[PDB]
Design a protein around this ligand. Structure first.
Ligand SMILES: Nc1ncnc2c1ncn2[C@@H]1O[C@H](COP(=O)(O)OP(=O)(O)OP(=O)(O)O)[C@@H](O)[C@H]1O
Ligand SMILES: Nc1ncnc2c1ncn2[C@@H]1O[C@H](COP(=O)(O)OP(=O)(O)OP(=O)(O)O)[C@@H](O)[C@H]1O
Ligand SMILES: [Ca+2]
Ligand SMILES: [Ca+2]
Ligand SMILES: [Zn+2]
Ligand SMILES: [Zn+2]
Lengths: 135, 458, 145, 96
């Protein structure tokens, strides 16, 4: 049991050292023998220790598109749901008392048609916003 | 009244959900019929008029009816998708966000990275009163309550998760309740949770398959204005037929390397174009008319277009299309230029592309073989090899079909979820608690009944 | 039946040369490289026919002036005035051509649609001539492996 | 060849320990035994950290084990590396 320093841990977890470790493991497994396995491992350890010490020594001294997409979603869905929010559905309901099965099927289809229209509006808004952002 | 309309709505939902796939097949068949009809299509005498030639005279009405039918079936496919596959997407999203909230504190101890659309959008669903609408775990808010109440503030966690303190105390104490009958429009409108529906619609809009089906519908609608837009629906065969997927995987498996190979080819051709534009320009005349020379390499861009278009497409290379260099001072240099172009571009790079496709085939075959070998040699759950069980005749198959069946584990999880907590046995309560805490130690790993009772059994 | 018909026409005896596959077992290992992935090989041709049909649709809608195939100025041999004729042109000479459809259609230099036609030809060469034939070759090689 | 070499590297790394070379099955007799062994007992990163700590430590303060390993490393003899043996394998019956 021994001590490991946080600086050593950070330098080991640097991606450069991880790539070096992967290359070393690949080389040892493919073009390396068992007789020299430990010797090669110690050489790699020494080189890695030196480079991490040097790295510590020298060290010691999209969002717009996402926001536009959420704004387009919020705005378009609010426009769609203002349908329900208007509360003016009473004059439709006066004849909802008097619908037929034909009419209720028509309303069922119209709901999905409105949803698809809102999706088209949302896609168009996203394209316009992306064009404005890149411009 | 309302009970009738809701029942008939549910019947329509069930019908479309049941017949979603059949309509998806029918759309492809109708698309093949329409595109077969469009193969007999003749342009007529300036303004050009496109007319469907027909000795029978009945292919035009057939085409009109087929276009209308395709447009209807495309809309029915969106309805069927929304009835059938949307609930699974919502269930998965609600389970993911709930587990991130509970076991990671995604909105309590950390925050979304401000570039994740999913993470930023999932803020809305937390405050809603209809959270796990599809997910089974209805006590996730109480779990977050218990886990982070003492640390990050009971009052703040309650505000974040939208649990009102007033309602709990109101129900616990004595209350006055007035029933509200469902016949009321005001009641049915108040019952709607607008925020949860907003979040659900956002998730559906951001779903990929729903976007593909919307593109299909848009193409179908545009087909009425121009009948040749129906040809885009032939691109649906990849999803329609699974046997086409194994062929397309040979390309999609190494797609990034395939694109980077084209980038490298474009760089190599640009270097060759630079060399030619600096030294070999007299050889790039492309006109037989002596008076007017069609100089193809007097411009960097024009010469690069020449090399990438005709140099690449030519079988022999750029020397197959540029002037013969015999009897010239730069004869040897130009010959080396052409030979190196042919070798590096025509031979090696195209071979790299072909090798990428072939290696994709081999990789897929090897992966399938490895899956089969692992499945036939070791048990999925415990991981013990087949030999130990095969010491008894048919032992491995008996073990994998009776003792450690993954289907049996799935059925046990379903039975434990559907069973009520009060009636749970001791073993069921143990497994239920351990599953709620997401600890998987109850799964046998490296051990089994026979291995524990080696000597007692035999 | 082939042997009997050979008496009426002696060239019907050539059909009996198709019996070598069954006659020689060493031929079977070669033919297995094709028969092992025959379904995928046929579906690859179907996919090629669909891709070529899409290219033919694009050309027939936009690039039709470039499909004259006659040197005689008086009589133009318009190869893409018909959907079926243009599809035959693309599947026959576009596919069989080493460079692609641009090796056989008119040069687009000095035209308004020059860049669009160049992209059209390059994509045709890449997707049809290079990738799909490589898919077929890879199928055979994977069968061997 | 490159694909096969990568696959072989992954297979060896997942089936046998880098240091001792014992197969994964022996450790997997205990649940998660191989991963516990390769992440706690025989970690090559842990060996690298030990070499760094032993180099940076002064000779006078070395423990007995540290002095043994230091002398053996100076003489470049690698017998201190466990080869074919481990703590669990030595204390098979005592531990269980
Ligand atoms: N835990 C396990 N549960 C089920 N099968 C297992 C398990 N461990 C190993 N196997 C093996 O997996 C194989 C079962 O394969 P799989 O469940 O994919 O379907 P199948 O039996 O090939 O047929 P089907 O296509 O009809 O489902 C058997 O050979 C079985 O021994
Ligand atoms: N002596 C050993 N030290 C570390 N890992 C070992 C050893 N022997 C075998 N392994 C295995 O090697 C694997 C570790 O791989 P590696 O160290 O290359 O990185 P990783 O865990 O894949 O991820 P990362 O890229 O984040 O480093 C594990 O499966 C582990 O069981
Ligand atoms: Ca009880
Ligand atoms: Ca001392
Ligand atoms: Zn098992
Ligand atoms: Zn080890």
């Amino acid at each position: 049991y021994f001590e490991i320093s946080e600086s050593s841990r950070t330098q080991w977890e640097k991606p450069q050292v991880k790539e070096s470790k992967r290359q070393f493991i690949f080389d040892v497994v493919n073009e390396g023998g068992e007789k020299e396995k430990m010797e090669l491992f110690v050489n790699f350890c020494e080189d890695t220790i030196f480079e991490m010490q040097l790295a510590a020594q020298i060290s010691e001294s999209s969002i717009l598109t996402v926001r536009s997409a959420l704004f387009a979603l919020r705005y378009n869905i609010l426009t769609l749901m203002r349908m329900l929010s208007l509360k003016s559905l009473k004059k439709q309901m006066k004849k909802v008392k008097k619908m037929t099965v034909k009419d209720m099927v028509t309303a069922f289809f119209s709901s999905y048609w409105s949803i698809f229209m809102t999706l088209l509006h949302f896609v168009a808004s996203v394209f316009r916003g992306f064009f404005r952002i890149i411009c | 009244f309302w009970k009738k309309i809701i029942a008939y709505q549910q019947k329509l939902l069930n019908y479309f959900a049941r017949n979603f796939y059949n309509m998806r097949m029918l759309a492809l068949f109708v698309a093949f019929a329409i595109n077969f009809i469009l193969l007999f299509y003749k342009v007529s005498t300036i303004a050009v008029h496109y007319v469907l030639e027909e000795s029978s005279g009945y292919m035009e009405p057939t085409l009109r009816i087929l276009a209308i039918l395709h447009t209807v079936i495309s809309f029915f496919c969106i309805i069927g998708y929304y009835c059938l596959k949307v609930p699974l997407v919502i269930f998965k999203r609600e389970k993911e966000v709930a587990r991130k909230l509970e076991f990671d504190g995604l909105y309590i101890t950390e925050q979304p990275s401000e570039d994740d659309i999913k993470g930023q959008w999932d803020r809305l669903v937390i405050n809603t009163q209809s959270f796990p609408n599809n997910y089974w775990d209805k006590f996730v808010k109480r779990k977050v309550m218990d886990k982070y109440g003492e640390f990050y503030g009971r009052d703040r966690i309650s505000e974040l998760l939208g649990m009102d303190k007033a309602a709990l105390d109101f129900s616990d104490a004595r209350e006055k309740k007035k029933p509200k009958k469902d016949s009321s429009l005001s009641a049915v409108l108040n019952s709607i949770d607008v925020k949860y529906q907003m979040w659900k619609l956002g998730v559906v809009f951001t779903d990929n398959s729903f976007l593909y089906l919307a593109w299909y519908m848009t193409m179908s609608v545009l087909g009425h204005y121009n009948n040749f837009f129906f040809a885009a629906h032939l691109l649906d065969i990849a999803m329609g037929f699974k046997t086409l997927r194994t062929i397309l995987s040979s390309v999609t498996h190494n797609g990034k390397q395939l694109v980077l190979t084209v980038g490298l080819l474009a760089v190599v051709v640009y270097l060759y174009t630079v060399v030619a534009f600096n030294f070999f320009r007299k050889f790039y005349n492309k006109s037989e008319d002596g008076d007017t020379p069609d100089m193809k390499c007097d411009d960097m861009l024009t010469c690069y277009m020449f090399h990438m278009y005709v140099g690449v497409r030519a079988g022999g290379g750029i020397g197959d299309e540029i002037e013969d260099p015999a009897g010239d001072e730069y004869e040897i240099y130009r010959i080396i230029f052409d030979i190196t172009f042919f070798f590096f571009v025509i031979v090696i790079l195209l071979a790299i592309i072909q090798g990428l496709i072939i290696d994709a085939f081999g990789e897929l075959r090897d992966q399938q073989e490895q899956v089969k070998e692992d499945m036939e040699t070791k048990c999925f759950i415990c991981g013990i090899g087949n030999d130990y069980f095969d010491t008894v005749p048919h032992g491995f198959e008996t073990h994998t079909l009776q003792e450690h069946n993954l289907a049996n584990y799935l059925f046990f999880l379903m039975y434990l979820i559907n069973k009520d907590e009060t009636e749970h046995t001791g073993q069921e309560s143990y497994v239920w608690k351990m599953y709620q805490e997401r600890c998987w130690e109850f799964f046998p790993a490296g051990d089994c009944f026979r291995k524990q009772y080696e000597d007692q059994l035999n």
